[PDB]
Write a protein that binds this ligand. Structure first.
Ligand SMILES: NC(=O)c1ccc[n+]([C@@H]2O[C@H](COP(=O)([O-])OP(=O)(O)OC[C@H]3O[C@@H](n4cnc5c(N)ncnc54)[C@H](O)[C@@H]3O)[C@@H](O)[C@H]2O)c1
Ligand SMILES: NC(=O)c1ccc[n+]([C@@H]2O[C@H](COP(=O)([O-])OP(=O)(O)OC[C@H]3O[C@@H](n4cnc5c(N)ncnc54)[C@H](O)[C@@H]3O)[C@@H](O)[C@H]2O)c1
Ligand SMILES: NC(=O)c1ccc[n+]([C@@H]2O[C@H](COP(=O)([O-])OP(=O)(O)OC[C@H]3O[C@@H](n4cnc5c(N)ncnc54)[C@H](O)[C@@H]3O)[C@@H](O)[C@H]2O)c1
Ligand SMILES: NC(=O)c1ccc[n+]([C@@H]2O[C@H](COP(=O)([O-])OP(=O)(O)OC[C@H]3O[C@@H](n4cnc5c(N)ncnc54)[C@H](O)[C@@H]3O)[C@@H](O)[C@H]2O)c1
Ligand SMILES: O=C(c1ccc(F)c(O)c1)c1cccc(-c2cccc(O)c2F)n1
Ligand SMILES: O=C(c1ccc(F)c(O)c1)c1cccc(-c2cccc(O)c2F)n1
Ligand SMILES: O=C(c1ccc(F)c(O)c1)c1cccc(-c2cccc(O)c2F)n1
Ligand SMILES: O=C(c1ccc(F)c(O)c1)c1cccc(-c2cccc(O)c2F)n1
Ligand SMILES: O=C(c1ccc(F)c(O)c1)c1cccc(-c2cccc(O)c2F)n1
Ligand SMILES: O=C(c1ccc(F)c(O)c1)c1cccc(-c2cccc(O)c2F)n1
Ligand SMILES: O=C(c1ccc(F)c(O)c1)c1cccc(-c2cccc(O)c2F)n1
Ligand SMILES: O=C(c1ccc(F)c(O)c1)c1cccc(-c2cccc(O)c2F)n1
Ligand code: NA
Ligand code: NA
Ligand code: NA
Ligand code: NA
Lengths: 256, 256, 256, 256
């Protein structure tokens, strides 16, 4: 591909799931890609699989990991054009009274501050390249979700932060956007479903929450990321919904 | 009541349903209320029932009816402080291919242009009184609805128009706001349900579309209108949702 | 290009401005494009310029023009994969009291019902092809604009209609999306500015309404349309903002 | 007043500014009010001033302070009907590169986790009383703000959390809503302005960011809170904008 040829992209949590889909999309568009992940298994295999992708072990909650990720990217490829902040986690369903402040802090540390820290360290290089930032948020930041107060809160923060940063970085020509996926079939979706009393029913329900009648694919999020990086040159501070229409209309959720 | 004492309010479609609830709320707050409706039966009874409410027969799609409504209101009460554009209609469910341009035009004529025409004729008086406009839109203007392309379109227009007009009238101190109800139990809701194969099931489904587990009441929309008129003095161009949370979260509406 | 190779696209108002940018984007992506426009001058030249684009004279407010547009497209190319409803108009600034119901109706006829009519006639063919609809709305439908009550209302309607139709057509695999541009430098923008007391100042103000410090280009809207057609396969009922960030933050628009 | 007679309300950060306005609104509506604040000066005076208001020293970032606040409220008044999470802080303008992860964490601790902790400890009592939660968020959580990445992020989180919690608590009849003010003239606004090179200009600019041409008052936020507590019985998970229209239209913030 040539849509993003000559560009260098860092994808956090790129070892599996949505992140791996985004990695593949950017490789297919001609970019060189750095796969950041805290686990080795998926990302190492992906590096072997994909010419133009390399793997760097990095836990985005560890500031020295992230500093090394940025400096290794520059040392090896000489520029940085796009950072995709995809690393994140959805805890199992938890009733509000079953949550804790400390668990909330830990989830904020990954879903929000990990995105903040890489963005901050990358911005000097993105400014030189007139590059861009893509944050992977969630539809449920906008519309809410049951049994997920901490998670919903972290994604509300990511989406809002995206707009703040877009404002700050617009004078430098650096665009900052986010993608808000809905149900995307990933290993995390599979893991969460396996915890439920009836996994198969949870998966059917998840497929049917969308007017389109299926969950989304990592490749579909990847395509949206490539669009934001390579062609959305008048888009900054937007929230691109990749949800199959889940937010549309009424569903199951006289006046007394 | 004294929250809106000494004020004069016009409520279109005030003979039944949401409009009658709004009429009652304003009377209870101390205002004098003009009940506008194209049908006599409900509004005439309401005038007899409520001291401080009077009924004026007026079809908001007929410009001379509306001109007379405004001039009779001023002749009888000497001022005009609030116009509530509630008159409107939801056609039966219709698939897109079952709609027509002419039916769409007719629905626009009521739901949108009727609101426009009264607002336009009232604004000289609202400017003198630093009064305000309240448009009754719908949640489905924001989130969509199935088998209702014309209706959804008219309410998307009302909500957007509310913001445009708020901008234009802000220099004059005239606030313009809208209320977007969700399922409110009214005669129109009952009529629509009676068309369905199973009315009781349609009503149960409608009650359950809300996290709160019931439909809303006309009095609850009425209370929101009184708030916007009497106490929301720093609110203009807002969309106040009165929906029981229907827009929140996923509902019923693997990656292949 | 090959992103949308073998596909057939109809672009209304494709003779100049945003529509011509969209035409060019789709041609560059490998599609065959039908340029619909009520004026001959731009579209005829564009047909001569672009292999793979042809021009059909058609006024989208004339139902028989639109019926012929669809049947000629099928007769000449054998399928229809995407309809881009771009034709529309922004009247000069008008204070609310300077508007009329009949001017409002005429603007609704173009900006809203023209989009409705082509969509309706195209949908049988889009269903066979699992094609998609792209409506060109406006940011000001969402956030409002001064001295433009009718225009704002028409675009609020288009955006809402997009969501309604997405719901109705999702069972058939037909996606329905809209693009909401902000200030895009087009002949209409130039014409409107030329009416102002100071055209150059109006244009400078328009450039600065965006954090990015410039207006957008037709090609940038075109790229977003190609993305929605060719790669956004899990997107339906979305509003894709192409605005340069104009909706972000505070601007020029103690407690007494 | 009698709108909220017999009810017990806790207002955090009630010693001055918006919180004190909310305290006064609830007292005027007939409620008994607990003023929570980390500083004694304003709240102690307010307790002396207002029959029906009492002051409890409490730092919402200190879990044992908050536990004692709830148990003292129940011991002294026998019930709890509404919690208003108003305590929060806006740091001085800070460019993204001038922020730190640790400052971000500290701001999250106040603006987000303080709201979480009181809500969590109050919910058993709110469930018994079918009470409600009101969170004071900010417009800039929704639209962004320049030189305020941490602040914007915290308020995006509060607004999203409000919707999540509304979903979780709806089966228990507990409503959870938020108010998103824009520029409200408060001591914090005055303090921030005094840091600027030209305070008077910053204040003029702040007044003019609103179509209404002034900043809002604490009493106006207070009225909106009383409405949400006492009359918005079909509202849950909403974001009530109290902004003077700042989010409407274009402002100051050719295609090359
Ligand atoms: N799957 C969905 O339906 C869905 C929906 C909306 C949003 N999202 C978001 O998309 C993102 C990816 O989700 P997914 O479903 O692909 O999850 P996943 O669990 O399948 O994959 C996430 C990847 O990130 C890595 N990761 C986790 N913590 C990390 C850390 N500290 N440092 C580096 N890498 C780390 C994991 O090792 C893994 O390879 C997350 O931000 C999630 O919130 C997912
Ligand atoms: N009921 C709901 O669930 C619901 C939900 C969202 C929005 N709404 C909106 O609320 C409004 C009232 O709805 P409702 O459910 O109370 O309906 P309703 O049918 O029960 O009452 C509407 C009233 O308006 C009158 N009316 C109709 N056309 C008129 C005209 N041309 N001139 C004057 N009066 C006219 C009717 O005669 C009637 O008295 C409408 O704008 C509707 O779109 C209703
Ligand atoms: N230019 C902007 O800043 C801007 C911003 C937001 C939205 N938009 C929307 O984008 C669309 C295109 O705007 P533009 O700026 O390119 O305008 P334009 O005037 O430059 O071009 C519009 C084209 O549509 C054609 N057209 C008009 N009426 C028609 C009809 N009845 N049938 C067929 N063709 C018809 C015109 O002849 C012209 O070729 C419109 O829907 C407009 O509302 C424009
Ligand atoms: N003023 C505005 O324009 C504005 C706009 C939008 C949102 N807000 C929000 O409204 C709320 C109040 O703002 P304000 O302008 O009135 O501020 P303020 O500084 O004038 O008052 C805040 C009050 O909260 C108290 N407080 C601070 N930290 C506390 C803690 N840890 N525990 C207990 N009390 C604490 C302070 O002592 C003070 O009395 C905040 O959440 C703020 O983000 C304000
Ligand atoms: O056979 C693999 C595979 C990889 C990607 C594909 F698209 C595919 O079709 C297959 C493979 C091999 C080694 C490790 C992992 C792995 C990936 C992701 C996460 C993990 O934990 C892993 F162990 N996969
Ligand atoms: O990873 C999930 C997710 C799904 C949608 C998103 F928008 C998102 O950001 C994340 C997910 C997967 C399986 C079940 C649930 C779930 C359902 C229902 C309630 C819950 O608490 C759940 F966690 N979530
Ligand atoms: O007995 C009535 C009534 C009216 C309002 C009430 F709240 C109530 O408890 C009862 C009544 C009497 C005459 C006409 C109508 C009427 C109203 C509304 C619409 C109509 O079509 C009507 F005929 N009602
Ligand atoms: O009057 C209705 C309505 C309900 C919610 C709103 F937000 C609103 O503005 C209007 C209504 C009543 C009964 C069934 C349906 C319906 C359901 C499902 C599909 C439909 O096409 C329906 F008409 N609607
Ligand atoms: O020289 C032209 C041109 C056309 C497109 C280009 F990108 C370009 O660089 C140049 C041209 C020639 C004839 C008619 C029109 C025309 C187009 C659009 C609208 C009109 O009214 C027209 F007369 N243009
Ligand atoms: O064509 C315009 C437009 C610009 C933005 C959009 F989002 C849109 O859909 C349309 C436009 C061009 C020049 C001036 C004005 C204008 C400014 C200020 C006030 C007005 O009434 C204006 F017409 N508008
Ligand atoms: O004279 C006061 C006052 C209080 C409220 C009013 F509405 C009023 O018109 C006046 C006063 C007295 C003691 C402490 C504080 C105080 C309040 C709020 C914050 C503080 O830091 C304070 F010292 N005020
Ligand atoms: O307390 C503020 C605030 C104002 C609006 C809100 F919606 C809100 O939640 C908070 C405030 C006060 C004075 C200046 C600034 C400011 C302006 C411009 C840029 C900034 O970084 C600022 F802090 N803010
Ligand atoms: Na490789
Ligand atoms: Na009477
Ligand atoms: Na050609
Ligand atoms: Na007291």
């Amino acid at each position: 591909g040539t849509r993003y040829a000559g560009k260098v992209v860092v994808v956090t949590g790129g070892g599996r799931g949505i992140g791996a889909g985004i990695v593949r999309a950017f490789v297919n568009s001609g970019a060189r890609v750095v796969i950041c992940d805290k686990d080795e298994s998926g990302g190492r295999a992906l590096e072997q699989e994909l010419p133009g992708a390399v793997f760097i072990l990095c836990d985005v909650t560890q500031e020295d990991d992230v500093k090394t990720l940025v400096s290794e990217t520059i040392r090896r490829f000489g520029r940085l054009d796009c950072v995709v902040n995809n690393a994140g986690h959805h805890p199992p369903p938890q009733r509000p009274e079953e949550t804790s402040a400390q668990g909330f802090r830990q989830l904020l540390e990954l879903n929000l501050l990990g995105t903040y820290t890489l963005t901050k360290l990358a911005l000097p290089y993105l400014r030189k390249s007139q590059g861009n930032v893509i944050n992977i948020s969630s539809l449920v930041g906008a519309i809410g979700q049951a049994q997920a107060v901490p998670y919903v809160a972290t994604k509300g923060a990511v989406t809002a932060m995206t707009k703040a940063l877009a404002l700050d970085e617009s004078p430098y020509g650096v665009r900052v956007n986010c993608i808000s996926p809905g149900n995307i079939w990933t290993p995390l979706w599979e893991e969460l479903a396996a915890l439920m009393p009836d996994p198969r029913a949870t998966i059917r329900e998840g497929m049917l929450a969308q007017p389109l009648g299926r969950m989304g694919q990592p490749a579909e999020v990847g395509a949206a990321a490539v669009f934001l990086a390579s062609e959305a040159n008048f888009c900054t501070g937007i929230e691109l919904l990749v949800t199959g229409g889940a937010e549309l209309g009424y569903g199951c959720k006289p006046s007394g």
